[PDB]
Design a protein around this ligand. Sequence first.
Ligand SMILES: Nc1ncnc2c1ncn2[C@@H]1O[C@H](COP(=O)(O)OP(=O)(O)O)[C@@H](O)[C@H]1O
Ligand SMILES: NC(=O)CC[C@H](N)C(=O)O
Ligand SMILES: [Mg+2]
Ligand SMILES: [Mg+2]
Ligand SMILES: [Mg+2]
Ligand SMILES: [Mg+2]
Length: 1293
Amino acid sequence: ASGLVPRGSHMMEILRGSPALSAFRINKLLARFQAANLQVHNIYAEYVHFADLNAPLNDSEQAQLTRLLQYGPALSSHTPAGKLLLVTPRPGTISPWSSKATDIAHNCGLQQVDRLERGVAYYIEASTLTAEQWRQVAAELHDRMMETVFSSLTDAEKLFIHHQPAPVSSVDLLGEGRQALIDANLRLGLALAEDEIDYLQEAFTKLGRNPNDIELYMFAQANSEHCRHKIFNADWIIDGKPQPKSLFKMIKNTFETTPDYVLSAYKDNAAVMEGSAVGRYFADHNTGRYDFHQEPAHILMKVETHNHPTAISPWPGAATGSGGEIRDEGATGRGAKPKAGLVGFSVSNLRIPGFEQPWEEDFGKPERIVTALDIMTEGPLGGAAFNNEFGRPALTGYFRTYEEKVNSHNGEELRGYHKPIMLAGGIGNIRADHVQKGEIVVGAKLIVLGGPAMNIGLGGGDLDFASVQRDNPEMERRCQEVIDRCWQLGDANPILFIHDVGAGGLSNAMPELVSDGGRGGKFELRDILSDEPGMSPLEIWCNESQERYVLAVAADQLPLFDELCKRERAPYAVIGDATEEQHLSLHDNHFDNQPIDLPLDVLLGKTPKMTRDVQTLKAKGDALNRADITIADAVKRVLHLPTVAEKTFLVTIGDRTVTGMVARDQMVGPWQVPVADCAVTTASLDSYYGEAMSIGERAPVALLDFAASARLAVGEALTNIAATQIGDIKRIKLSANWMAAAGHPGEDAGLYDAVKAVGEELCPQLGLTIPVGKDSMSMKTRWQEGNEQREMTSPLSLVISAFARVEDVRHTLTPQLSTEDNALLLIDLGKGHNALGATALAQVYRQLGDKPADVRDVAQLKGFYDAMQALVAARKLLAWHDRSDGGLLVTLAEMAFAGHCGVQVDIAALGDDHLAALFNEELGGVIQVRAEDRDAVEALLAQYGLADCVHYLGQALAGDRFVITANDQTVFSESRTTLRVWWAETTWQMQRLRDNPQCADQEHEAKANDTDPGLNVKLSFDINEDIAAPYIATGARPKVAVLREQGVNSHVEMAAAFHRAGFDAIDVHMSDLLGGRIGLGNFHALVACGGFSYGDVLGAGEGWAKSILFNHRVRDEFETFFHRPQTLALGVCNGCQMMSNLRELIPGSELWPRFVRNHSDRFEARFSLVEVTQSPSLLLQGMVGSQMPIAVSHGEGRVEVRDDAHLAALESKGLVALRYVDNFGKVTETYPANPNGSPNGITAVTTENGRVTIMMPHPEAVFRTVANSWHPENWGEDSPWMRIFRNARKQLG
Ligand SMILES: Nc1ncnc2c1ncn2[C@@H]1O[C@H](COP(=O)(O)OP(=O)(O)O)[C@@H](O)[C@H]1O
Ligand SMILES: NC(=O)CC[C@H](N)C(=O)O
Ligand SMILES: [Mg+2]
Ligand SMILES: [Mg+2]
Ligand SMILES: [Mg+2]
Ligand SMILES: [Mg+2]
């Protein structure tokens, strides 16, 4: 019975929600209050919803709103008791939750809802607390950067205050002289240099009028280091000598040397290289049918960073890092399609409570930034939240910790990552005729595609609210869909030009766009979509609100554009027109004035180039002090370094299967151990051509040797990618992302030497192009600690990402050792240098050491690569794993973990210094070959000049022994399981602190049981028998409705699975049904696909389902469909959730459960073992008793019943169709074998008639054998799961 009060010209309603925190989270709050000496007896939390209404709700509408706001796990309600503390978003902000919840209310016919918002009501019983202690309690319950605490529910009215538009303000240069600019510079935080103030002074003096604030702000954002790249274009003088090239020209040298296969470099916000001719699969604009289009799928690539914002607010910082990079990809050329991501983090020491490591010292930090631990807790969740909700798989990455007091180039100082590296990148595909940006005709319409804006991130950043970003990935997915429809029109693609909206917001993006066409623009401020009516023109034009693009379309294509956008529900606005005159005009219809009126050459005019006159500093290395070092202690420590240690916390939080094109993800083999050295995707759903991505980075090396650190980043990118079938090294293309503390003594000369080392030397010599890259030049943090200045300065940190077209994805090797008769060979590209400076070993004993690794011999590096390519293509490798952090010791350990076996290796040939042989991080790695091939492989390597680098080590053996000898002496010997568990402790402790500790513990303890047989298969049918073939051979192809709501993302691969089984797959959007363009009476089959419809706001699948239920016409249509006597329907993942919420329309579904937040409280992207159980399901005919793995990617997959009576009834009806099993084959509730905590392992149910089946796993992700993370060697093209789609076809007849 809800509250409803006046709220300005509107009315606010208050709707109580469900309990907000599980028992473990409640207990964690209680323990934190107790650890803080706050005497709190109990705490209870409930969601509370606030609906700001523009008109009243009738009783039917009010019941609908109430039902929309019922979602989530059915935790036990408590009557409110104690003190209320309500936590909400800060006044003046609108949560993403709000944007999505409101969209659902509108799509359910509740136009009276102006806005919905959510808070958490905490009820705290703590009668003995003082006022100051209550403030400490409040501090504990909210994020000061994003949220506010209120003492009354009615205080939420504050979130919905209507503000009138703020006017433009002029800066009085004519009336005050230069002082007006000086004042404005400080007031608005423009950070203009003196010569910039000169430039602006003269420009406005010439125009004879005062600049407006907006014009000054625009200019200031455009001329920032972040936007202008002054350092990378500067002239240099080093140790008194003028240099001949800028940094950027040295990078371009690699393209001048090696243009091969490059289609686009340095003229877009991504590079493009040649791909392969394959079947690009999408729905025809006229028919709606999915069809393969044989044509080149070229490959785009991009990598960038979001370091500053992540130090302040890591979740949105990481999230919008991903988001911005995805926009760069989609805005490549005249439109393109992101396809897989990568992720990188560098932080200071974690100092996990209760798990502190011996090398870690708390050196303090600025009060205003978060800790390394907080970045590694919230930041990966943020990045993953964007990749998941947007729907691209995230398939490779790095994570480095570093924070130490070292004697480096500027003597003893603190070096680290208090300002982190937060890196996001990826690959996409693009059509050949869309690679080149088009011309912009005079009179083109200039559009903003995407989200209504707010005053976010203005200028890129008393709290620093301006550095707190905001992410709405489903908005970006809706925009990508439009982009996709555009490029899918081929020659009729209406996009003439497109670009990301990033730094400077529209103030940078729209001038950029018209200027890149040789045009001007005239714009109308009040045509831009806004969610913040109070904004000034400066705020409108300059804010860095997210999920926006700018594009130019011919006027005659507007009607087509509008159709495309409304079908996807992507907001857009025409905001201006391209002009012949090279002028920028922004008009304001509300204030009847002209906030901007400038010639473009004034606006975009440059001050002089920078000159950097700098000097070399070079650290003298100190030999490693080995006093406290033993080999055994060193192994234990190194395996405890986060950089080295298992990465599961960063991997399984992100989807790795959406698209159905993932051939090689991080997790390897039957034991799913995250050690894959590179990512591999197929180019299409009908090819074994593909793409690969790898990363190399070695920043600690730069504390000793700048150039060596850059050469090793390139080298390690190659050694990570080398056991994938590529061929010519010139196919490999690099992104070079440069992170430095420019100005810090020695770093500038170091930067130049490092750019020279790779751009002018190593890359040209190898034939590697760097066609893309970025720079971030303020990687240092300063603060006052007690009475003293403190500073934490990053090493020069180059990150290389390598990208390549792949000739045959099937031939990729992993670190999974075989125990067939074998040989382990080390390829030591260190040539016995065995350097220990700037290694993991040094780091874990708080040292830097003397001399680091380096590329020792350029010809031998190329030789290693070409040798590996020859071995891959000839199928002579059983496994490969490169040497990087932690040395040969860690390479061998990780191979043994992935093969769940032992090794017996001898290192006597590697030098007398066993510590250095085992722990150097020189380039190279370990190949495993069949024992019978040893001599031939050693001869092949010898051809490439490598004989002296090649060393036979020994063999992999069944069992649990990890043994390193030197002739007669045992150097090191341990249980492989003991090592594997130690290596897992970091991810264990991270999971434990972030997720349900019960789940974290179960996952960790499972690794200690060596008897685990790994994923394994039992098949009740012949996976090669195409039971649909006789039907397909008739040419009669039944339609399937491939149903998608906004935010759904696994529809293309779902279509292709049905297509292979003989269906004509039709793209049916929920907008198609709502608009009359499709009726389900024309179909015999329907599938509800996976994704994040409405970002799962109001419960996964809930908005989708309730939008059906609350439209009587569409509801009737679905009901009619399900009540027909022979129709078939399938719901997968989000579609499973949707159909579970739609069960009142589905006969025989009365016993179905709900699907809710996983027990782990975390998204689970796993390759899990299931068994097919006896049920009516017509889609699982022939498969009962089969056990095989399947892709799982969900956060809300836990079966929830009303009570045991309901579970028992469901079970006794026999409607359960799939169950999770552990690797021993038993039905399980233990995690992560059962990833979500479903009772009795339930993960699929069917109806009484078998005609409708719903399941949480994704059969469409894995119907192709090549897209199964691990599979039996003997499978052909089809996996077991292809049988589901074939059964559907045969059932139809
Ligand atoms: N930030 C991250 N996000 C996702 N995957 C990651 C991340 N860091 C590491 N990985 C994955 O974990 C595995 C081990 O990483 P790492 O040991 O850094 O690789 P390598 O030593 O081969 O360069 C690899 O498959 C890698 O792609
Ligand atoms: N891939 C999917 O369909 C995921 C479903 C939903 N977004 C969840 O996380 O539970
Ligand atoms: Mg590693
Ligand atoms: Mg590697
Ligand atoms: Mg690495
Ligand atoms: Mg066993």
